[PDB]
Structure 1
Amino acid sequence: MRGIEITITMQSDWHVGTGMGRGELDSVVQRDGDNLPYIPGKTLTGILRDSCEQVALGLDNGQTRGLWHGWINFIFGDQPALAQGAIEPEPRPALIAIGSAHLDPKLKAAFQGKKQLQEAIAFMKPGVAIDAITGTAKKDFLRFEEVVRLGAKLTAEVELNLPDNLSETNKKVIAGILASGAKLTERLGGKRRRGNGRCELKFSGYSDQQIQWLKDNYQSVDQPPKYQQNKLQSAGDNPEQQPPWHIIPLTIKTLSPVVLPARTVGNVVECLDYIPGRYLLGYIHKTLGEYFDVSQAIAAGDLIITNATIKIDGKAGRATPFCLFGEKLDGGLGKGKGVYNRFQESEPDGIQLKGERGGYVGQFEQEQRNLPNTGKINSELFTHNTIQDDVQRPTSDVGGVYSYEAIIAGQTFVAELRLPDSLVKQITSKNKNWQAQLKATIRIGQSKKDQYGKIEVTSGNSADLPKPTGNNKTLSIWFLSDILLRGDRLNFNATPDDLKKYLENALDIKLKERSDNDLICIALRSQRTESWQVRWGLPRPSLVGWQAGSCLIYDIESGTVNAEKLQELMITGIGDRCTEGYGQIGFNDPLLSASLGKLTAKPKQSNPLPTNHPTQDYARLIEKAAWREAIQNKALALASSRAKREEILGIKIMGKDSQPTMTQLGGFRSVLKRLHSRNNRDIVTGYLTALEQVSNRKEKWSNTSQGLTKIRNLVTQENLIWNHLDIDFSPLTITQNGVNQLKSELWAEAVRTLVDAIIRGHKRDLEKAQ
């Protein structure tokens, strides 16, 4: 069940901490991949759960354990971190999955490219401590804090995956509790207890009637039904595998951040920079298990799903060969120069090289004239905490802080689903449009119910089968993915002569290691992998092998290398566990074959809101704030020039004197503060005409540049203030007709800001001359 949405309206200024400051700011707010403020889904679930537990207290008569706490554990999942002792029941997952609440998509789009607006959404709030004795600001307790302007309307997807067997009665219970939590929730984020972050939270399609049903029925409920795993069901239908291999490219785009545990270590999880093929198998079930016995195919090895690597050159990127070495100072693929394929090239004279390790290289060919294109994955370390629910702060007993590396949004990946014709015949004969049905959005990774894990999947058209170049002199091997091999006693191990035996047997040839003193034969690194059987709630056995990008080369000692057998192994992969993406391999690739030392790398708007759009009122606040600061800056820029003060008002310095005397400016300045609104131009015009009538006061403004007329113009001509300031307001506006709406709005303040700036700036230059 999808398309339930939470809506949030912030009714006071609000703050979601990064848990740190930056520079002059002691607190700064979390911003999404579009640099706007947003509420992380992990916060949102945490707050909503907390209010639901308040309801559970009210229904369990304050018993901290009971039937209704049972329901909350049912709805929001158990907290096996905090329960302790010999708890026997498996920890249940939540039924409810909640995204991050983002700003409205149109408002978000409007800010694109408009950096100064993206800043103006926040503003600084001060804070201070007072010494109880002296009753003054306690120095070195002065604090400046970023907060986000109120009135923001945010929304997040919710998904419920209620059990299909769930009683209709229990659905209204769950709707009752969830509705109640939204109603009872009042605040989120930082300094809740001091008035930041007051909000309304509502579910689409839940209303008081849902609470009314609970209030009428709640005494009749029971404990929630016990949880059940969704087991597999094999069937044995699969027609036995026959060539050709079809190859379906799947494109994956990270719509949200994704967490892909490389190695857990205490309270922090490091992330990969590719998507393991194992993550997609659930999606294979959810979209193809109606057409063939997916589970039988895996056990037979009739299916392979590769890893997803970053897309480069329109295709799957390839992990950088460890045969490449860069000049320790000046070179390597990171610097676009000085890269040596040590299978073919000597080290340069004197210069020490270092082997390449990270990153991905795109396409290469027998003479590219350029180093292959290099890909990179952007990643960020997100941070979270646990609240100890009674003292309502983190504590070391509750585990404090934890953090995840994530792949950020907008990164894009490619993987290949590889199927024998045997299954494709079955699938196609049942549905010719199946490749259209592969288009889906799914959740994968760690923490997948919350803000993490949203990815788009999209089939391309069928790719061509790879066509390795046969070469009866030499076999050369590139590990495109991690390679797992059993030792001769079925244990895992990593000994390269096992792989020597393996390949020569599989290709039905004999191999000899490259013996040359200055061309390296072998460049491998070990690999070890943490993993979990989610089917069984236990870790997987620690896989050990060679990591992707390891490479090695051999001379062929005897036999002939069949080009067709090479193709087969490149499609199927070698070693163990190939089905989930390991074992992927490339033979005689031109990149391992060519010499590259001479080469280098190659050289390397927005639209308005409709006036009727609901967030237009919120955008109006951002527009005014950004305009105000820009006006203040540009007025102060123009006040800085002694020619500009003469141009605009005719004030100038002549010898020791100012024209007019400072008192005459001060008099005018005192009147100008009555110019609150454009109709008040009466008052300023009234003053100037009363001034002009008194000859002695009129001539006080002689030796100005026409000053009395210049002031009259600036106060009267609606355009003239904007002509002087000369601000391109286009990057500072986003509302339809916002420019005219805001110019007519701010006119009175623009005048006050400009004249005040000029008079003040003029005074400084008078002091220099005086």
Structure 2
Amino acid sequence: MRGIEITITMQSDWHVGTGMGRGELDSVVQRDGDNLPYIPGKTLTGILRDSCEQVALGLDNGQTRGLWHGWINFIFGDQPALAQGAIEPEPRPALIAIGSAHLDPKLKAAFQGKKQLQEAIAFMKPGVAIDAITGTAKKDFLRFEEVVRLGAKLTAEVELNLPDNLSETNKKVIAGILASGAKLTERLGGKRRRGNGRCELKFSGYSDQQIQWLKDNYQSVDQPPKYQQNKLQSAGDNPEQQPPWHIIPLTIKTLSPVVLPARTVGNVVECLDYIPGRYLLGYIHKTLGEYFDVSQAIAAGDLIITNATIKIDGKAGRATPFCLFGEKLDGGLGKGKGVYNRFQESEPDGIQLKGERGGYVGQFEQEQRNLPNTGKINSELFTHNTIQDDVQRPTSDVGGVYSYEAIIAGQTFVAELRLPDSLVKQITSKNKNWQAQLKATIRIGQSKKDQYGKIEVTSGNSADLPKPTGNNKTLSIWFLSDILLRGDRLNFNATPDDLKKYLENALDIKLKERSDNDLICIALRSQRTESWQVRWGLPRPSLVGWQAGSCLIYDIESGTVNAEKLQELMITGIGDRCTEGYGQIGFNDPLLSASLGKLTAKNPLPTNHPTQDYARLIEKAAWREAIQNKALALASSRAKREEILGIKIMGKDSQPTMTQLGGFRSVLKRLHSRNNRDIVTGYLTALEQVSNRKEKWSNTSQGLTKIRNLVTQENLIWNHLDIDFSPLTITQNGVNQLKSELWAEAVRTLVDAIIRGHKRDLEKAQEN
């Protein structure tokens, strides 16, 4: 389902999300992938939950547990980290998913590349603590905080995956609670109690009619329905698998950060730099499960979804082979030079090598003449807290803070769904446009309901099958996924001899480790994967194997390898759980045969737009501070002061005296608008009409007329400032209007800077 939104109108300046500060700031707000401020969906869920907890706590007549608190645990899910002892029921997930509230997409586009404007969305708020007896600032207690301008309208997508059996009364209860708790929300973020973070929070479609219904009906409302999993159902009716194997390449693009747990340890989750195929098995069950028994196909091994690895050269990036070694001082794939395939190249004299250990390499033909392109996955750490509800601040009892690494938005990954011809016949007999159903937007990962996990999936055209070369002299193996062999005792403690025996049996060829002493023959690392199974409500077992990237090469002692069989093993994978993407091999790849040591690497807002008012506040800020900084620079040179006003130093002397500049500057304080330029022109004519005062300004570089011009030629302040305002404006007709608005302030700002820089250069000449 889709269509619900939360609209957040920020009604005071607001601060959210981060325990860090920039150069002049000791607290910096959280910023999306566009570097624009946003309300994270975990903050928004937590704020909206709290306000629903208030409503329920009122409807419960102040009982901390009761009927309506049950409804909150229905809508927002139980909090199993709080409860202690033998809680028997499995924890309910939320019915509501709430995204991060981002700025309007068109406004966000206006900002792109305008770094100066992105900074102008927020400003320093001062903060000082006063000593109660002295009435003066305490030592240490001086802070400067980034705050985001009020008026921001942010919107978050919301999804309500209500149960299929839920009654119309219970639907209206959920709407009533959510509409109520939204309207009860008046603040969010940091320092809500001291002004910040005031807001209106609205759902689309939840008017006060939804609150009024609850008011009329809350006394009639039962306990929420019991939660149950959507269990799997197997038809068993699939065909037997038949060759060929179709390959349906799925592009995955991350649209919000995705947490793909590598190591879940304490208060931090570390993230993979690839999407395991098991994350896509739910999307495969959704889209294709109407055409064939996906669960039977998984059981039979008629289905593979590979890992989504970073897209390189338009294809799936391949896990960097551990046979590649870089020069420890001045080589490796990140340097783009000095990479040796130790399966084929000796270690050079003097220089010691280090193994490559990660990242993904692109494509490489047998005569690439270049190092393969290296893809890197960008990942960011996100930090969250839990609030203890009675003290309304994090505490040790609630665990305080936790972090997720996430694959950030905008990353593009390629998976492949492989299916046998018999299933593709089955599907195509039921839908000829079935690959069009593979277009979806889905949530995967950890924390997938709130801030994390939104990905677009799009299918390509049917890709070509792999084309391994059946070399009869040597066979190499490159691990592109994590191989999970079982030992002969069915535990995972297999060894490289188990892999040798496995491939020997599968390909019907005897193998021996190659003995060339300068060259390495095996370059494995082990991997242990810890995972949860959502259908079990228990962790999976522990899956031990070898890491993607591990490599080995064998001398083929007897038998002949079949490229038809190498291809079959390059589609189905080897070992356990190949349906999830484990077991993905590369056979006789060029990059493992090649010798590499010699190679090297290769718009403005519409005028009517609703955020035009807000954008104009950002513009004035960016313009004002631009004018100020330029006025400082221009005033820092005596040639620019003499050009703009004629003011100059003549030894100890100032032309004119500082008293004459102070008189002018005191009149320019009255230049609030271009309707006040008559005030300054009044002063100048009076000065000019008195001979002794006019002579006070001789030996200026025509300073009286330079002042007349600057006050009466509106373009001239902008000519002197010579600021390029294009990076600083986003409103259409922003430059013309802001010039008409900020003119008098720019004149005042420049003259004030010039006269200060003049006096302080005069002090260097005068104070000797």
Which residue of 2 is the match for residue 232 of structure 1?
Answer: 232
Q: Tell me the C-alpha RMSD between the 2 structures.
A: 1.4
Residues 208 and 127 of structure 1, relative CA distance in 2, 3 Å threshold: same
- Partner SS state of residue 296, structure 2: helix
Q: Which residue in the other structure is 1:5 paired with? A: 5
Superposition deviation, residue 670 in structure 1: 0.7
- After superposition, the C-alpha distances for 1:634-662 in whole angstroms (9 at most, x for unaligned) are 11211111111111111111232111111
Percent same amino acid at aligned positions?
Answer: 100
Cα-to-partner distance string for 1:184-213 (whole Å, 9 max, x where unaligned): 000000011101101110001011111000
Which stretch has the larger CA shift, 690-699 or 284-293?
A: 690-699
SS at match of 2:548: coil
In 1, Cα distance between equivalents of 2:520 and 2:270:
32
Spell out, residue by residue over 1:383-424, the C-alpha distance to the aligned partner (whole angstroms, 9 max, x if none).
Answer: 111001111111111111111110001111001000111011
Give the Cα separation in 2 of the matches to 1:713 and 1:266.
68
Q: Counterparts in 2 of 1:608-687, with a 5 A limit?
A: 608-687=604-683
Task: Tell which deviates more after alignment, 121-130 or 248-257.
Answer: 121-130
Distance 1:719 1:350 in 2: 68
Give the CA deviation at 1:240. 1.1
Instruction: Work out which of the residue numbers 741, 756, 763 in structure 2 matches 1:760.
Output: 756
Q: CA deviation at 1:516?
A: 2.2
Give the superposition deviation at 1:474: 0.8
**Contact 2:183 2:202 survives alignment (8 Å):** yes
| Cα pair 1:238 1:292 within 8 Å, conserved | yes
Counterpart in the other structure of 1:491: 491
Distance 1:462 1:506, change over 3 A: same
Q: Give the secondary-structure state (helix, strand or coil) at the position aligned to 2:344.
A: coil
Query: 1:468 aligns to what?
Result: 468
Is 2:720 the partner of 1:724? Answer: yes
Deviations 1:35-63 (A, max 9, x none): 01111000000000000000111111111
Q: Deviations over 1:416-461 (max 9, x none)?
A: 0001110111111211111122111000000000110000000111
Residue 20 (structure 1) shift: 2.7
Find the counterpart in structure 1 of residue 318 from structure 2: 318
* More displaced stretch, 11-20 vs 194-203: 11-20
- Write out per-residue CA displacement over residues 218-245 of structure 1, whole angstroms, 9 at most, x where no aligned residue: 1001000111110111111211111111
In the aligned structure 2, how far is the partner of 1:501 from the partner of 1:533?
31
Secondary structure of the residue that 1:483 maps to in structure 2?
A: coil
Deviations 1:571-627 (A, max 9, x none): 1101111011000001110111111111111xxxx9110111000000000000000
Tell me, what secondary structure is at the counterpart of 2:714? coil
- In 1, Cα distance between equivalents of 2:516 and 2:628: 72
Q: Is the Cα–Cα contact under 8 Å of residues 17 and 27 in structure 1 kept in the other structure?
A: no
SS of 1:145's equivalent? strand
Which stretch of structure 1 is more off in the superposition, 14-23 or 737-746? 14-23
Q: CA deviation at 1:510?
A: 1.0
Counting only pairs closer than 5 Å after superposition, residues 162-173 of structure 1 correspond to structure 2 as 162-173=162-173
Q: Distance in 2 between matches of 1:359 and 1:742?
A: 48
CA deviation after TM superposition for structure 1 residue 707, in Å: 1.5
What is the CA distance between 1:23 and its match in structure 2? 4.4
- Tell me the distance in 1 between the aligned counterparts of 2:335 and 2:742: 51
Partners of 2:405 and 2:186 in 1: CA distance = 31
Q: Note if contact 2:488-2:494 (Cα within 8 Å) is conserved in structure 1.
A: no
So what's the TM-score if we normalise by structure 1? Answer: 0.98
Decide whether the 8 Å contact of 1:440 with 1:457 is kept in 2. Answer: yes
- Name stretches of at least 5 consecutive residues in structure 1 with no aligned partner: none
Distance 2:405 2:359 in 1: 17
How far 1:767 sits from its partner (Å)?
1.4
| TM value normalised by structure 2 | 0.99
User: Residue 24 of structure 2 aligns to a residue in which SS?
Assistant: coil
Within 2, Cα distance between the matches of 1:508 and 1:655?
A: 98
SS class of match (1:307) = coil
Query: CA contact under 8 A between 1:481 and 1:549: conserved in structure 2?
Result: yes
CA distance in 1, matches of 2:114, 2:21: 24
Whole-angstrom distance in 2 between the partners of 1:246 and 1:713: 77
Task: Give yes or no for contact 2:574–2:583 (8 Å, CA) kept in 1.
Answer: yes
Greater CA deviation, 703-712 or 622-631? 703-712
Number of matched residues? 766
Q: CA deviation at 1:24?
A: 3.7
Taking the aligned partners of 2:525 and 2:645, their CA distance within structure 1 comes to 75
Distance in 2, matches of 1:340 and 1:711, equals 71
Alpha-carbon distance in 2 for matches of 1:424, 1:655: 92
CA contact 2:255–2:454 (8 Å) conserved in 1: yes
CA drift at 1:333: 1.1
Contact 2:482–2:583 (CA<8 Å) still a contact in 1?
yes
- In 1, Cα distance between equivalents of 2:338 and 2:688: 78
Secondary structure in 2 matching 1:193: coil
Structure 2 distance, partners of 1:164, 1:89, is 21
Give the whole-Å Cα distance in 2 for the aligned partners of 1:17 and 1:232: 39
- SS for the counterpart of 2:396 is coil
Q: Distance in 2 between matches of 1:662 and 1:491?
A: 90
What's the secondary structure of 1:646's corresponding residue? helix
Q: Structure 2 CA distance, aligned partners of 1:529 and 1:157? A: 33
**Preserved CA contact (<8 Å) 2:185 2:201:** yes
Task: Note the C-alpha offset of 1:494.
Answer: 2.8
1:19-168 matches, within 5 Å, as: 19-168=19-168
Secondary structure of the residue that 1:125 maps to in structure 2?
A: strand
Q: Tell me, what secondary structure is at the counterpart of 1:299? A: helix
1:704 paired with 2:728, answer no
Contact kept, 8 Å, 1:259 with 1:406, in 2: the verdict is yes
Deviation (angstroms), 1:144: 1.0
Match in the other structure for 1:737: 733
Stretch deviating more after TM superposition (427-436 or 497-506): 427-436
CA contact (8 A) 2:17 2:40 kept: no
Residue 241 of structure 1 aligns to a residue whose secondary structure is coil
Tell me by how many angstroms 1:762 deviates. Answer: 0.9
CA–CA separation in structure 2 for the residues paired with 1:594 and 1:126: 62
Aligned to 1:290: 290
SS of residue paired to 1:645:
helix
Q: Secondary structure at the match of 2:248?
A: strand
Counterpart contact for 1:274–1:307, Cα < 8 Å: yes
Q: C-alpha offsets along residues 240-271 of structure 1, whole Å, 9 cap, x if unaligned?
A: 11111110100000000000001111111111
CA contact (8 A) 1:639 1:758 kept: yes
Aligned structure 1 segments of 4 or more residues deviating by more than 4 angstroms: none
Aligned equivalents of 2:67, 2:457: Cα separation in 1: 41
Kindly provide the CA deviation profile for residues 144-173 of structure 1, in whole angstroms up to 9, marking residues without a partner as x: 111111111100000000001000000000
Q: Deviations along 1:65-107, whole A, 9 cap, x unmatched?
A: 1011000000000000001111111100000000000000011
SS in 2 for 1:194: coil
Q: CA deviation at 1:522?
A: 0.9
> In structure 2, how many angstroms separate the alpha carbons of the residues matched to 1:148 and 1:562?
65
Q: Is the Cα contact below 8 Å between 1:303 and 1:419 reproduced in 2?
A: yes
5+ residue gaps in structure 2? none
How far off its partner does 1:696 sit? 1.4
User: How many Å separate the matches in 2 of 1:732 and 1:680?
Assistant: 27
**8 Å contact from structure 1 (residues 494, 526) kept in 2:** no
Specify the SS of the correspondent of 2:130: coil
Question: In 2, Cα distance between the equivalents of 1:50 and 1:278?
Answer: 34
Separation of aligned partners in 1, 2:721 and 2:20: 38
Instruction: State the Cα distance separating 1:296 from its structure 2 match.
Output: 0.7
1:108-507 → structure 2 map (5 Å cutoff):
108-507=108-507
Distance 2:403 2:651 in 1: 66
CA separation in 1, counterparts of 2:732 and 2:350?
A: 66
Once residues 740 and 267 of structure 2 are traced to their aligned partners in structure 1, the CA distance between those partners, rounded to angstroms, is: 55
Aligned equivalents of 1:732 and 1:396: distance in 2? 45
Are the equivalent residues in 1 in contact too, given 2:39–2:101 (CA < 8 A)? yes
Aligned position for 2:684 = 688
Distance in 2, matches of 1:198 and 1:317, equals 46
Are the aligned partners of 1:121 and 1:622 in contact in 2 as well (CA < 8 Å)? Answer: yes
Q: How far did residue 336 of structure 1 move?
A: 1.2
Q: CA deviation at 1:25?
A: 2.0
* Cα deviation, residue 563, structure 1: 1.0
For residue 133 of structure 1, report the CA deviation from its aligned partner.
2.2
